[PDB]
mmCIF file of C-alpha atoms and ligand atoms in Angstrom:
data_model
loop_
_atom_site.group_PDB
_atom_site.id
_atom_site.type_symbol
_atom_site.label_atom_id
_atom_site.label_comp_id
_atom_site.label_asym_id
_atom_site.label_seq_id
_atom_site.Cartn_x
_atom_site.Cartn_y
_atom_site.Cartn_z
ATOM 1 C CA UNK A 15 36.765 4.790 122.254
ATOM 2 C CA UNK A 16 38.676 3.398 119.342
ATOM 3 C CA UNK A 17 39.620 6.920 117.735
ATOM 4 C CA UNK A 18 40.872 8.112 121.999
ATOM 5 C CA UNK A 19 43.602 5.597 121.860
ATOM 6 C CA UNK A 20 44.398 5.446 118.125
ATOM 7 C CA UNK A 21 45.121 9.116 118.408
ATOM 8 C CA UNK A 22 48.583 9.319 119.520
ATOM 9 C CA UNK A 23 49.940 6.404 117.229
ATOM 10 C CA UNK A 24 48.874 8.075 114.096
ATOM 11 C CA UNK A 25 50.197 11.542 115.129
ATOM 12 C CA UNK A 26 53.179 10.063 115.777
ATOM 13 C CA UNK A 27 53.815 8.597 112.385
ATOM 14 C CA UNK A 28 53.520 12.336 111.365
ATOM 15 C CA UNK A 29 58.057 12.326 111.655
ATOM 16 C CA UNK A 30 57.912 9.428 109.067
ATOM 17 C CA UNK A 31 55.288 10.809 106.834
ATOM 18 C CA UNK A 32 57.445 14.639 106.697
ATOM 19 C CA UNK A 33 60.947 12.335 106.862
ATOM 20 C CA UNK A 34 59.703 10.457 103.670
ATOM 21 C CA UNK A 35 58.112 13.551 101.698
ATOM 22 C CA UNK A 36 61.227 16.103 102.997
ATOM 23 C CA UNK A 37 63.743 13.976 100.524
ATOM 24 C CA UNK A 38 68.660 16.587 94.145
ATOM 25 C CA UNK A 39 69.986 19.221 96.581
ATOM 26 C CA UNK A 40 68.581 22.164 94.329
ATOM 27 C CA UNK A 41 65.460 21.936 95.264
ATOM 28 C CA UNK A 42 66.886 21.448 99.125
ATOM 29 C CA UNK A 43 65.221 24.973 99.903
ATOM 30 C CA UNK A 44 61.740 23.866 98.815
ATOM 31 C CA UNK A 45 61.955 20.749 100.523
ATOM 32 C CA UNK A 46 62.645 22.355 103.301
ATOM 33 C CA UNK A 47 59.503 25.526 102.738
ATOM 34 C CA UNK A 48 57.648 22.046 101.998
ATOM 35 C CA UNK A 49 58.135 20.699 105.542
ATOM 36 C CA UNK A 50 57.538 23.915 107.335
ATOM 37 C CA UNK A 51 54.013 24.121 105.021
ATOM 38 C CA UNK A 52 53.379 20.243 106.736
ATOM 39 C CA UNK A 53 54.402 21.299 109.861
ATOM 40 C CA UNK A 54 52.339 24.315 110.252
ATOM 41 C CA UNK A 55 49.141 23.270 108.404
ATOM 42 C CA UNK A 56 48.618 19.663 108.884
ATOM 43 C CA UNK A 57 48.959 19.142 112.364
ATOM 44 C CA UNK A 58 46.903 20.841 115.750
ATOM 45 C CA UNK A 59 43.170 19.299 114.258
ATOM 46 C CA UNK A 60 41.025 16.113 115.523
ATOM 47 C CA UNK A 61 42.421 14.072 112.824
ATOM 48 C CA UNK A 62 39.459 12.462 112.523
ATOM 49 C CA UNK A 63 39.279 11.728 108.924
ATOM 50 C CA UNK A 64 42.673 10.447 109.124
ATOM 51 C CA UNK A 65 42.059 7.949 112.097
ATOM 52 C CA UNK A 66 38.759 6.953 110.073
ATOM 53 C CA UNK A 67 41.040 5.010 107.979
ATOM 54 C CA UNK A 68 43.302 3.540 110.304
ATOM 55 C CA UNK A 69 40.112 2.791 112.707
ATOM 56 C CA UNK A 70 37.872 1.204 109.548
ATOM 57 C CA UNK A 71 41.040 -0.796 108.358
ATOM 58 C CA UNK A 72 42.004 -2.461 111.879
ATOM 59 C CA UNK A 73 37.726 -3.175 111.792
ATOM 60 C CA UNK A 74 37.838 -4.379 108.390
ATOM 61 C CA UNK A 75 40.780 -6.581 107.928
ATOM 62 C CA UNK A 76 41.368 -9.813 109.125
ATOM 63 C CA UNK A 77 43.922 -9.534 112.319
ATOM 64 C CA UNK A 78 46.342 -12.372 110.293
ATOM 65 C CA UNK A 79 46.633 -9.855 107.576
ATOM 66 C CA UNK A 80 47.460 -6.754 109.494
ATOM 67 C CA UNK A 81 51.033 -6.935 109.528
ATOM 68 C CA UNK A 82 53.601 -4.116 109.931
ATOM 69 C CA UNK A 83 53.570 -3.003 105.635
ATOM 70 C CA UNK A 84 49.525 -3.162 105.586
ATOM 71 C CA UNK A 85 49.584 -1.525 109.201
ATOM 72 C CA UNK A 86 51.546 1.160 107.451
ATOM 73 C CA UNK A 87 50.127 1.530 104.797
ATOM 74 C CA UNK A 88 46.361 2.142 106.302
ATOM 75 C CA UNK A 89 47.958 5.691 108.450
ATOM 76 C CA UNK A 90 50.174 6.785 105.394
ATOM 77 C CA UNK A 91 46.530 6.752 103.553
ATOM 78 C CA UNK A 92 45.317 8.389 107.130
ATOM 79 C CA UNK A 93 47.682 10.748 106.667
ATOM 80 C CA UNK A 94 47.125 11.311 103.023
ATOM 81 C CA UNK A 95 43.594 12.406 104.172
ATOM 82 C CA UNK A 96 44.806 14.227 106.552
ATOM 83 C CA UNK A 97 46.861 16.401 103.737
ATOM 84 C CA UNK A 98 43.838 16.785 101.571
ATOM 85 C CA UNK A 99 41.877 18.537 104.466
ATOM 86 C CA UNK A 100 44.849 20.851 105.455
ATOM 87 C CA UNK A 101 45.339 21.545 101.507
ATOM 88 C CA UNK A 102 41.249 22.543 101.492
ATOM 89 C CA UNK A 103 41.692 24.187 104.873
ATOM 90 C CA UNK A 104 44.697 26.632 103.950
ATOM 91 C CA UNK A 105 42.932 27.751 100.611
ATOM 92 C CA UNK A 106 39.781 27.889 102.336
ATOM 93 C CA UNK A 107 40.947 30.703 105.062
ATOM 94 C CA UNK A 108 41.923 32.706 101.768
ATOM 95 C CA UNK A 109 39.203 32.669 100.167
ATOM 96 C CA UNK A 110 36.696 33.291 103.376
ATOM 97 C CA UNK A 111 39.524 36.292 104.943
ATOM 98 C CA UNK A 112 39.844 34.019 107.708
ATOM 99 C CA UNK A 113 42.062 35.219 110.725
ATOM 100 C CA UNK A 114 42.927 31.898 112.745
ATOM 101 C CA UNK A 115 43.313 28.426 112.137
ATOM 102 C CA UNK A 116 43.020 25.691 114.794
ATOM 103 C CA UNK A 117 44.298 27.884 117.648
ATOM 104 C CA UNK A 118 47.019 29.794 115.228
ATOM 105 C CA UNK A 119 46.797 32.397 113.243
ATOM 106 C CA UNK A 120 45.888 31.106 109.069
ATOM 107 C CA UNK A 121 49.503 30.201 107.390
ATOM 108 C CA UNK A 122 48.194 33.036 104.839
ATOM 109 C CA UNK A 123 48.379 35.613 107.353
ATOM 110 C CA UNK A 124 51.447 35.130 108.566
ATOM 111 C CA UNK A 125 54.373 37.522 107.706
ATOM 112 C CA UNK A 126 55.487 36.954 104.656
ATOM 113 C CA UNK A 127 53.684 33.757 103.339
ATOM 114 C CA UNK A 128 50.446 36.496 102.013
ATOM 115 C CA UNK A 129 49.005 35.090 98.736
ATOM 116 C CA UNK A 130 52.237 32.742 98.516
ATOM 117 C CA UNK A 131 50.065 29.909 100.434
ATOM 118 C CA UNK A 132 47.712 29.468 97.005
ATOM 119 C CA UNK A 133 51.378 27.733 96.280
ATOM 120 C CA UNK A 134 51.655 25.908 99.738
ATOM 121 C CA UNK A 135 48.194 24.406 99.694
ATOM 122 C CA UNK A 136 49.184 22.871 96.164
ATOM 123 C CA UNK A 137 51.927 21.478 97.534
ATOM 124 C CA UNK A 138 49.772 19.402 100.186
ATOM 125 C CA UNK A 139 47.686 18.315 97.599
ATOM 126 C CA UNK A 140 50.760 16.698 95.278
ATOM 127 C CA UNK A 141 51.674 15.029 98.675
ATOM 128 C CA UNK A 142 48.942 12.759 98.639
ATOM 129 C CA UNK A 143 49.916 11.007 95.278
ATOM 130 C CA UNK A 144 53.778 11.006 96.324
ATOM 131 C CA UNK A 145 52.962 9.131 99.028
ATOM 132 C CA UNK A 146 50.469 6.778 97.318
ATOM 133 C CA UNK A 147 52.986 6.157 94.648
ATOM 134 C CA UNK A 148 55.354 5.580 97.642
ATOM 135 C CA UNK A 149 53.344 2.926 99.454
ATOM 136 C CA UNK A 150 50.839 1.471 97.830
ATOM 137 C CA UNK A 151 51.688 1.595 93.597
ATOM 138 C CA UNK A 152 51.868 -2.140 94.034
ATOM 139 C CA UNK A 153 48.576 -3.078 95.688
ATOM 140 C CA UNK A 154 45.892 -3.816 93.576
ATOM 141 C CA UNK A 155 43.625 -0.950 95.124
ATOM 142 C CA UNK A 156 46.155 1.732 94.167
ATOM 143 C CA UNK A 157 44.152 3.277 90.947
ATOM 144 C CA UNK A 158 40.924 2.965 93.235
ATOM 145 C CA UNK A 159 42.741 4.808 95.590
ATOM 146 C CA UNK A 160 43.736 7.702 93.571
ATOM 147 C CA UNK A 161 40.670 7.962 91.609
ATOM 148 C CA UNK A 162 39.221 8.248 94.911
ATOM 149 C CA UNK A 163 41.354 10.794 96.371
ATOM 150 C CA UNK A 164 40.508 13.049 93.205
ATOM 151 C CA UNK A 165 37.152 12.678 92.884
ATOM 152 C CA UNK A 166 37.091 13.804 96.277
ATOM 153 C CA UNK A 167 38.767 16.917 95.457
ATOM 154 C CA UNK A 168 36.425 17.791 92.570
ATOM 155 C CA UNK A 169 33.839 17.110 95.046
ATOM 156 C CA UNK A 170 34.695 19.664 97.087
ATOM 157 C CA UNK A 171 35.373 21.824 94.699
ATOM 158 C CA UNK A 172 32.360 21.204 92.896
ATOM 159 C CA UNK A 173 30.740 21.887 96.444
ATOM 160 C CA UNK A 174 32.811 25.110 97.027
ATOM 161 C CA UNK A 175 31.592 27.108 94.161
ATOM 162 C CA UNK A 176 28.879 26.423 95.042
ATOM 163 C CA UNK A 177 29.739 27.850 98.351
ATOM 164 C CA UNK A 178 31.218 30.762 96.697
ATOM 165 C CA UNK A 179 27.987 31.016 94.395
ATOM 166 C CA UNK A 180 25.846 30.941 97.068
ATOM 167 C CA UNK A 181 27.668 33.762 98.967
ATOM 168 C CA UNK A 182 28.727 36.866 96.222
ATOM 169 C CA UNK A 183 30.296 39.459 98.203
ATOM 170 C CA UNK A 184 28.051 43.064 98.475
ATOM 171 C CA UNK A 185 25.483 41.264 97.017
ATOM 172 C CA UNK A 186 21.714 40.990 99.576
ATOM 173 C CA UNK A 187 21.652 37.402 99.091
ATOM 174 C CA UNK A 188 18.282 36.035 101.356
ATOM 175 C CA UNK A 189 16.184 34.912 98.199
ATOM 176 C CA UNK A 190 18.966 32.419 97.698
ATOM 177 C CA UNK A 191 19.454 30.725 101.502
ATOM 178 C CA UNK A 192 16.920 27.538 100.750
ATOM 179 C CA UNK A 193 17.268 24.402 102.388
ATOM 180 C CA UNK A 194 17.586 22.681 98.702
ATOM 181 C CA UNK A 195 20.476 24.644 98.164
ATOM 182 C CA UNK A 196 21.866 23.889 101.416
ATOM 183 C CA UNK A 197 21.850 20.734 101.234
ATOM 184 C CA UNK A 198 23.434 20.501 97.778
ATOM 185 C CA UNK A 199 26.433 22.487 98.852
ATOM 186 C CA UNK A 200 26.929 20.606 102.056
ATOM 187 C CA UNK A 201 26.880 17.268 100.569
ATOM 188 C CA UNK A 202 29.918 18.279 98.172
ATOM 189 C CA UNK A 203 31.670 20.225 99.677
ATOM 190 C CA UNK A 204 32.203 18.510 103.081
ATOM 191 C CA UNK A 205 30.272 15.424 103.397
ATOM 192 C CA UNK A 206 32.151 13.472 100.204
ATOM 193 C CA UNK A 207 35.326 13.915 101.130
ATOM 194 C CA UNK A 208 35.103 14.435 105.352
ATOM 195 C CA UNK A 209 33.228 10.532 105.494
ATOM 196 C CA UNK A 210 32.490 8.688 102.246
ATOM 197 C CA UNK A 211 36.302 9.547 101.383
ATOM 198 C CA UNK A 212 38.245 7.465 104.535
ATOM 199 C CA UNK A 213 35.845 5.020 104.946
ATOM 200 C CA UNK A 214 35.549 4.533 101.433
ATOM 201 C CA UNK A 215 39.781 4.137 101.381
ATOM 202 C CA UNK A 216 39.785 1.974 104.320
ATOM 203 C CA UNK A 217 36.808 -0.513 102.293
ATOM 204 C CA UNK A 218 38.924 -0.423 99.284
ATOM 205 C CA UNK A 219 42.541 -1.914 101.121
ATOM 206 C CA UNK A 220 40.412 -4.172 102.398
ATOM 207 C CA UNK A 221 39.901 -5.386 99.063
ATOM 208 C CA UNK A 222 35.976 -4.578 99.463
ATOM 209 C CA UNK A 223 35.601 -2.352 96.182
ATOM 210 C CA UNK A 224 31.707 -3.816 95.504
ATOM 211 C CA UNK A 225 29.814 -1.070 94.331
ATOM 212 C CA UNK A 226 26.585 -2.151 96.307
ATOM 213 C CA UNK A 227 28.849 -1.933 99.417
ATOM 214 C CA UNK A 228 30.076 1.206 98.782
ATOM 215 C CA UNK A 229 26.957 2.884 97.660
ATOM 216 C CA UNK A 230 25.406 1.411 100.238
ATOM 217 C CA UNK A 231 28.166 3.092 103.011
ATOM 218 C CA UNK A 232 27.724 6.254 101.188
ATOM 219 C CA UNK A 233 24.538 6.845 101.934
ATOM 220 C CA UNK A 234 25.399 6.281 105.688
ATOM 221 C CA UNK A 235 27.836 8.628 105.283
ATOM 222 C CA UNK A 236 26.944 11.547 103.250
ATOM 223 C CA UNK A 237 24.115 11.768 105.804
ATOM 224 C CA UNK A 238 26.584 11.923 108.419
ATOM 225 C CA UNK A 239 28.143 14.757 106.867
ATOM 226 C CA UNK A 240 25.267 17.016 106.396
ATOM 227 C CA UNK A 241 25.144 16.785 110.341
ATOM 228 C CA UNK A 242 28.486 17.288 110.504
ATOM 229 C CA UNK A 243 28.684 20.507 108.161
ATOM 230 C CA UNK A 244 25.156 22.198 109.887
ATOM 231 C CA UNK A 245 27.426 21.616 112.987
ATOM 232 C CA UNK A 246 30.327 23.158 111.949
ATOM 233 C CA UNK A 247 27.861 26.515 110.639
ATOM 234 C CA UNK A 248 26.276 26.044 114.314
ATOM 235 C CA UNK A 249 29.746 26.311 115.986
ATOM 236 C CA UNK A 250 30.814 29.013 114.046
ATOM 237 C CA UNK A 251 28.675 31.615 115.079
ATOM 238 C CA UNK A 252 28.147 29.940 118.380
ATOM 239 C CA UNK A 253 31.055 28.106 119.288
ATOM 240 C CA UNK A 254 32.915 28.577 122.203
ATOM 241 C CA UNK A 255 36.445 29.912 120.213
ATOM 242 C CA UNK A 256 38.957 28.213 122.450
ATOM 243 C CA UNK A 257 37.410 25.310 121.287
ATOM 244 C CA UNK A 258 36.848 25.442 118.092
ATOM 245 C CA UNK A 259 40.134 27.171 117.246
ATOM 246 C CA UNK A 260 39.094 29.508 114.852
ATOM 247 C CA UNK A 261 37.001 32.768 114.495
ATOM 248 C CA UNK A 262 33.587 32.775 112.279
ATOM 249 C CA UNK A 263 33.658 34.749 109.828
ATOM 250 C CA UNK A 264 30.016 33.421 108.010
ATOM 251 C CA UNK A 265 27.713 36.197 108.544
ATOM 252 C CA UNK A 266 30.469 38.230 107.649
ATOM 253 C CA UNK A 267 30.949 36.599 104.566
ATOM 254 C CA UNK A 268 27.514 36.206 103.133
ATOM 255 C CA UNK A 269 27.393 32.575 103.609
ATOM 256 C CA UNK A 270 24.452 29.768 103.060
ATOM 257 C CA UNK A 271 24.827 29.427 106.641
ATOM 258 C CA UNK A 272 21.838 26.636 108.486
ATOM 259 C CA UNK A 273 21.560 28.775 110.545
ATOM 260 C CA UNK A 274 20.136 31.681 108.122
ATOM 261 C CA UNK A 275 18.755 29.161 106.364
ATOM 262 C CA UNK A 276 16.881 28.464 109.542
ATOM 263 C CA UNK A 277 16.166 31.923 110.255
ATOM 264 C CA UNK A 278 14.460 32.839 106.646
ATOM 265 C CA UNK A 279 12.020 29.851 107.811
ATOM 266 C CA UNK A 280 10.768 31.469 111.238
ATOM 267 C CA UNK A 281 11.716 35.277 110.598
ATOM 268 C CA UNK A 282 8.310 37.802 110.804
ATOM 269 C CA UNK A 283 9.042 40.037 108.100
ATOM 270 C CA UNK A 284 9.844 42.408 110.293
ATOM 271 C CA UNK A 285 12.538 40.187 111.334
ATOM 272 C CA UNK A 286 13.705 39.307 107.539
ATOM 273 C CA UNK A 287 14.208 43.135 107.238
ATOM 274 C CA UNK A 288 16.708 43.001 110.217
ATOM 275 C CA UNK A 289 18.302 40.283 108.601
ATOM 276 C CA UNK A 290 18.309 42.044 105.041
ATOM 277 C CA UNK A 291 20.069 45.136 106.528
ATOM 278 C CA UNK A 292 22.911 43.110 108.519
ATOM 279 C CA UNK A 293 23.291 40.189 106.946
ATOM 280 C CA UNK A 294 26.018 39.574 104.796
ATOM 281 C CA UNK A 295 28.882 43.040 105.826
ATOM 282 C CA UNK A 296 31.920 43.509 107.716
ATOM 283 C CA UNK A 297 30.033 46.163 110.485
ATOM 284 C CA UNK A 298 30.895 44.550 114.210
ATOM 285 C CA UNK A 299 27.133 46.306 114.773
ATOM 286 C CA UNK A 300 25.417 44.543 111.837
ATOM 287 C CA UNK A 301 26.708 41.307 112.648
ATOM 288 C CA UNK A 302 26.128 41.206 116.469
ATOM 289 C CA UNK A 303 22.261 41.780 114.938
ATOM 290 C CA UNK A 304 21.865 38.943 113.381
ATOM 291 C CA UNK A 305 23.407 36.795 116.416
ATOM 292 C CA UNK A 306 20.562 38.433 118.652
ATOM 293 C CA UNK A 307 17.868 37.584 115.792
ATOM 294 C CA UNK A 308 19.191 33.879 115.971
ATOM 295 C CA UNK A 309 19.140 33.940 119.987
ATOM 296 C CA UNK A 310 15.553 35.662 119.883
ATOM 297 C CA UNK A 311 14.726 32.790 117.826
ATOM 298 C CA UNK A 312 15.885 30.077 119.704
ATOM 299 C CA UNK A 313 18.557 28.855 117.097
ATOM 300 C CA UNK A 314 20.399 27.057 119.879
ATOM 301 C CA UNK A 315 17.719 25.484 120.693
ATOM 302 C CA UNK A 316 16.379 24.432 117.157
ATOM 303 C CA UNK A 317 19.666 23.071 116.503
ATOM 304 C CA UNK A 318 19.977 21.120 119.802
ATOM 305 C CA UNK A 319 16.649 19.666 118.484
ATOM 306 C CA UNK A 320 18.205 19.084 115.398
ATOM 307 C CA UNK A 321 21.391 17.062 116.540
ATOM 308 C CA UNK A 322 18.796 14.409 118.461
ATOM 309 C CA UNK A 323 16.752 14.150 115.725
ATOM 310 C CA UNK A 324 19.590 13.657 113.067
ATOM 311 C CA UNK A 325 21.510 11.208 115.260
ATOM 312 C CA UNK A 326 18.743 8.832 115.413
ATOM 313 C CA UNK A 327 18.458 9.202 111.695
ATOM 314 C CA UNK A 328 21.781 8.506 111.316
ATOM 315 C CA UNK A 329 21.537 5.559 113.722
ATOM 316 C CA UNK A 330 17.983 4.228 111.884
ATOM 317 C CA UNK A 331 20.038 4.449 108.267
ATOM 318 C CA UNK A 332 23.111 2.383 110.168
ATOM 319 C CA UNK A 333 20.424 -0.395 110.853
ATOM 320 C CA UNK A 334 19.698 -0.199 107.410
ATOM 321 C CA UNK A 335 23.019 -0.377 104.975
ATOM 322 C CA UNK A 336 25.535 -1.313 107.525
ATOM 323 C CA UNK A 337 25.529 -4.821 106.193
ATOM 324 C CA UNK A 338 27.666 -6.732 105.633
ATOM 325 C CA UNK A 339 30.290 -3.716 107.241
ATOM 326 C CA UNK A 340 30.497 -4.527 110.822
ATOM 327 C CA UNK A 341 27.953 -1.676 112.811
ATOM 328 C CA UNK A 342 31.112 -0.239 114.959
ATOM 329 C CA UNK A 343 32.745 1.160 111.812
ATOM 330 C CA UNK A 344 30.010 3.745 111.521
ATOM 331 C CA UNK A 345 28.948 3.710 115.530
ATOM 332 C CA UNK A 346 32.911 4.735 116.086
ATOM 333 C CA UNK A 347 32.580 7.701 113.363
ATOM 334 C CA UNK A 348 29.103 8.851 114.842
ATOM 335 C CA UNK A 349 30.401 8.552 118.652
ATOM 336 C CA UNK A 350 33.196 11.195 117.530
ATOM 337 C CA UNK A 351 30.470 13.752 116.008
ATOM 338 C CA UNK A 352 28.022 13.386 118.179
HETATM 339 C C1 T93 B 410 41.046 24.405 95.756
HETATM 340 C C2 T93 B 410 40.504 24.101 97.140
HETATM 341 C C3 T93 B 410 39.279 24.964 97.351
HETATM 342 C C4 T93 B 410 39.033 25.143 98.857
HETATM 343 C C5 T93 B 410 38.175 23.969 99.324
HETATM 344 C C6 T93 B 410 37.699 24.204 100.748
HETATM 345 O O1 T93 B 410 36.868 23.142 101.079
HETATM 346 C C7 T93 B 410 36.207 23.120 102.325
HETATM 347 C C8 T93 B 410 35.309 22.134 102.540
HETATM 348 C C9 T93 B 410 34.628 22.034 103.742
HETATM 349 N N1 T93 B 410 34.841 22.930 104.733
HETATM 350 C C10 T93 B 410 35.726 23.932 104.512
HETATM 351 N N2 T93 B 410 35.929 24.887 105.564
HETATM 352 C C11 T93 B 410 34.846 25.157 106.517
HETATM 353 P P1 T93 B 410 35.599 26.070 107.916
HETATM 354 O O2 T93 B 410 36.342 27.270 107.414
HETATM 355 O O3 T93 B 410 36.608 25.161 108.574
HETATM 356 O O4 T93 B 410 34.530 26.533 108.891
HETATM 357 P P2 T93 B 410 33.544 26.238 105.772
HETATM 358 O O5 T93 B 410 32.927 25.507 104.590
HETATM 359 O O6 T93 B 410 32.489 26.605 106.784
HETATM 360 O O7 T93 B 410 34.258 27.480 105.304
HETATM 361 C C12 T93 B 410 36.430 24.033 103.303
HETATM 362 MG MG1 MG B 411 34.567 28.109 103.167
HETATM 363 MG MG1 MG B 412 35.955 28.712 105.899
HETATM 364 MG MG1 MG B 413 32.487 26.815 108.817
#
């Protein structure tokens, strides 16, 4: 698997990417909060966004043109998404009263970083363009690059207030958990910037900016992400936690959940009553009754369904826009989420 041996080479050029960033001796104590932010929050994930671009660049360009620059370049832009996820993640876990983070405890909890990290997340974000400007001002993709890296951001922020909409604290919320609006906050808020985003980088260095092409890779991978983000609700309640490194928290939190969404479509109304009364509050009790109104309705199960039939939609839509991209850019992505 192209992403299984990749994995080690890009997390090792992690040391250059803080050396570069980490360097006017007044500011020397930011600098130095600055690395401990990179340290803490952008490494211990999959990286699979980030080794989409180095994977999709090594499948896109010609071998004679991957020397050592354009080999570096492709996992500083790896890297860069990479740093917008871990800026999204640590602002994220504030805003849901997360409690852990990919096996650790969210940077906002710790001792004295507390409402501080709103600052630290930031400062991932302006990473991205430093290293941009740092490596690739004088390609001709570097604009496309950066437009791309912030329309990705007001994707996903577009896509979490919508989240945020969808989910008003106190609030008995059912009437709102629709597959329509599922879907729309899905699509922005994870699936533009988790898949279109490093493919999208990856075609772009390759000099492939066509908007057929890329509108035609979109809609491979927005799809993708819809999968992706009903899995991520799935594991969340369901999710064995070692894995997963983190703790749900979207029952809890009143979320637009799948699964609920899922549940409003087969609950009796005695069952949407159950669901009414629990749904949405901090009780242990309440919660652990909505788990056993998932489990009594075979939620596993309909999303185990679910992931087959997706994946050979996914697969059917690869058949279909793939062209002229070679198949095992998208085959690679799908292997890892499947
Ligand atoms: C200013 C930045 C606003 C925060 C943006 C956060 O964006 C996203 C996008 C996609 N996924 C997440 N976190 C996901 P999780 O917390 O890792 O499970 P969630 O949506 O289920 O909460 C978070
Ligand atoms: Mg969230
Ligand atoms: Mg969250
Ligand atoms: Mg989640």
């Amino acid at each position: 698997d192209v992403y299984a041996q990749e994995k080690q080479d890009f997390v090792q050029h992690f040391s250059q990417i803080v050396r570069v960033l980490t360097e006017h001796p007044e500011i020397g104590d930011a600098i130095a909060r600055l690395k401990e932010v990179l340290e803490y929050n952008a490494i211990g994930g999959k990286y699979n966004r980030g080794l989409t671009v180095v994977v999709a660049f090594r499948e896109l360009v010609e071998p004679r043109k991957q020397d050592a620059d354009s080999l570096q370049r492709a996992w500083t832009v790896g890297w860069c998404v990479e740093l917008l996820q871990a800026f999204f993640l640590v602002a994220d876990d504030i805003m849901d009263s997360s409690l852990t983070r990919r096996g650790q405890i969210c940077w906002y909890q710790k001792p004295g970083v507390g409402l501080d990290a709103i600052n630290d997340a930031n400062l991932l974000e302006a990473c991205i363009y430093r290293l941009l400007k740092l490596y690739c001002r004088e390609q001709p993709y570097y604009l496309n690059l950066i437009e791309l890296f912030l329309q990705s951001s007001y994707q996903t922020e577009i896509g979490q207030t919508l989240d945020l909409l969808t989910a008003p604290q106190g609030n008995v919320d059912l009437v709102r958990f629709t597959e329509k609006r599922y879907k729309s906050i899905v699509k922005y808020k994870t699936a533009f910037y988790s898949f279109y985003l490093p493919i999208a980088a990856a075609m772009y260095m390759a000099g492939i900016d066509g908007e057929k092409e890329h509108a035609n890779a979109k809609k491979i991978l927005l799809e993708m992400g819809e999968f992706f983000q009903i899995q991520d609700d799935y594991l969340d309640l369901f999710g064995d936690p070692s894995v997963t490194g983190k703790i749900g928290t979207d029952i809890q939190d009143n979320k637009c959940s799948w699964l609920v969404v899922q549940c409003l479509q087969r609950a009796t109304p005695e069952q949407y009553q159950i669901l009414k009364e629990n749904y949405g509050q901090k009780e242990a009790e309440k919660v652990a009754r909505v788990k056993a109104l998932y489990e009594e309705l075979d939620l596993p199960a309909v999303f185990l369904q679910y992931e087959e039939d997706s994946y050979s939609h996914i697969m059917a839509l690869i058949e279909q826009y793939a062209a002229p991209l070679p198949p095992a850019v998208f085959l690679g992505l799908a292997r890892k989420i499947y």
